[PDB]
Amino acid sequence: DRVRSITLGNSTITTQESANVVVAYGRWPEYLKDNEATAEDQPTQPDVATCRFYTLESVTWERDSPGWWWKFPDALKDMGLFGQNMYYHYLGRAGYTIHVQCNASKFHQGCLMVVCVPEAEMGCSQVDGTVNEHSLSEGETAKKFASTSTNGTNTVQSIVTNAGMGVGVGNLTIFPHQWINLRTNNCATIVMPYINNVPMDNMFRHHNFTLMIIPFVPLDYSSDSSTYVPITVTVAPMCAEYNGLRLATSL
């Protein structure tokens, strides 16, 4: 009941302490069909060369950590053939399987929230200003929330209670989400379909969804337990499609 295995392409994930799997709105990923298509050229479907697990860089969960976020896509634009296909085409489409891992002993305590947010438009820490692209995303490196109000030009207002969006963070449960309670489980798994208002889109211009990881109960331990506790993310695209082949763009 607690064991799980997931296979995609030439990659496989096992786990012995999982809770369940969240299918975002009861909708599994799928390819675009004919009575919903607008673009006319025949699309390419690589199908094992792109649909497989890629692992990003880890972060260190310290006693005073506000939280982390990533933007998708553009966190996977340098990951093998998925990224190469992103560079050469005008239109792309894909769903995802996200898996978050964090293990600790039966003598530690803490609680993390793992949430996927579609169209997470963010605000600037200068009210009459605008954000730079660097402030929203550093590729495979995570951005970091703050515990107090922030200053600086072109940077995101990142105090963790407002989640960079002007809402109450305790309401983020309206989105697809799981929890990692250190006494209960050690991993979270979310399956996310393609969610947009058009059937396809350009993968450089538009961030489809943001992954947020926020500790609600801080990490705590006693006398001589282990101090280093990392968190790891692993994401696999699903049902990937591309249209509009031309010469490779450059940022």
Binding site: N20, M122, G123, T161, Q178, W179, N181, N197, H207
Partner: protein
């Protein structure tokens, strides 16, 4: 020919009678880490009587929640002036300047509907030392310009010919004008939030102003008159109908700052109380 259409009302669930219990079924023990909300009722946890519940969730459907007129723009314009631009009013269409309708719409990521648009127009005699005249009733012209259309330069510009643009002419003292507008967007739905750029190099214009592009409105007096100055105010009201919405979002906590961005000032989660145990005494002689 008559055709009968049957309406099904949807009332809420009854509560079933329940007695004592001593077993291994544990409805009250759950695990929130799964992302699952518990579907327990009072009948699982206490002893209950049977109730036939007749209440209906009719007024909390999306259509009844959204189908009410709301103001979205106000502007003024004069009959005579020395600025040549204060004789007509004009603006770009959206629903981002008045906070009530904006916040209400922003509980959802995507929306699609038709609109019913109403205008309310009032006039007034400007303050002066010499008052008193005999004017005929004033007439007003409202013209809508889709993007790419020619723009008026003054109140006598040729563009007020309105050969292909839709316009409304109206006279004071009558009922407020009204017309309906279909769902007009190059996408499959309107977008309230857009986490992206306008340029393929990840710069340029950020967010909402990349996608809207739905023309302008211009309004003028028609008489071309007024020996003594006068001022008019026009207000626009929107009402959506035949609605569909997708992807709910947490409601806005911080106060709005401008109409182009989601920028905000950090705000508290709620207001405070004396203690985590504090609850006021209300039963006293």
């Amino acid at each position: 020919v008559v055709e009968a259409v049957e309406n099904a009302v949807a009332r809420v669930a009854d509560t079933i009678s329940s007695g004592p219990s001593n077993s291994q079924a544990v409805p009250a023990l759950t695990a929130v880490e799964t992302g699952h909300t518990s579907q327990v009722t009072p009948s699982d946890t206490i002893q209950t009587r049977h109730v036939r519940n007749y209440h209906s969730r009719s007024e909390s459907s999306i259509e009844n929640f959204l189908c009410r007129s709301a103001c979205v723009y106000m502007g003024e314009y004069h009959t005579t002036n020395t600025d040549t631009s204060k004789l007509f009013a004009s603006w770009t269409i959206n629903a981002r300047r008045m906070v009530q309708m904006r916040r209400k719409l922003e509980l959802f990521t995507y929306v699609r509907f038709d609109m019913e648009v109403t205008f309310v127009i009032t006039s007034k005699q400007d303050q002066g030392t010499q008052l008193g005249q005999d004017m005929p009733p004033l007439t007003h012209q409202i013209m809508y310009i889709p993007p790419g259309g020619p723009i008026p330069k003054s109140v006598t510009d040729y563009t007020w010919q309105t050969s292909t643009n839709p316009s409304i002419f109206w006279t004071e003292g009558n009922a407020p004008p009204r017309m309906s507008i279909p769902f007009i967007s190059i996408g499959n739905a309107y977008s309230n939030f857009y986490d992206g750029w306008s340029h393929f190099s990840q710069n340029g214009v950020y967010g909402y102003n990349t996608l809207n592009h739905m023309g302008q409105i211009y309004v003028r007096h028609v008489n071309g008159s007024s020996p003594l100055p006068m001022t008019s105010t026009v207000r626009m009201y929107f009402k959506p109908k035949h609605v569909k919405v997708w992807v709910p979002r947490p409601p806005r906590l911080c106060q709005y700052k401008n109409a182009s961005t989601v920028n905000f000032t950090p705000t508290n989660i709620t207001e405070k109380r004396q203690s985590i145990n504090y609850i006021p005494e209300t039963v006293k002689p």
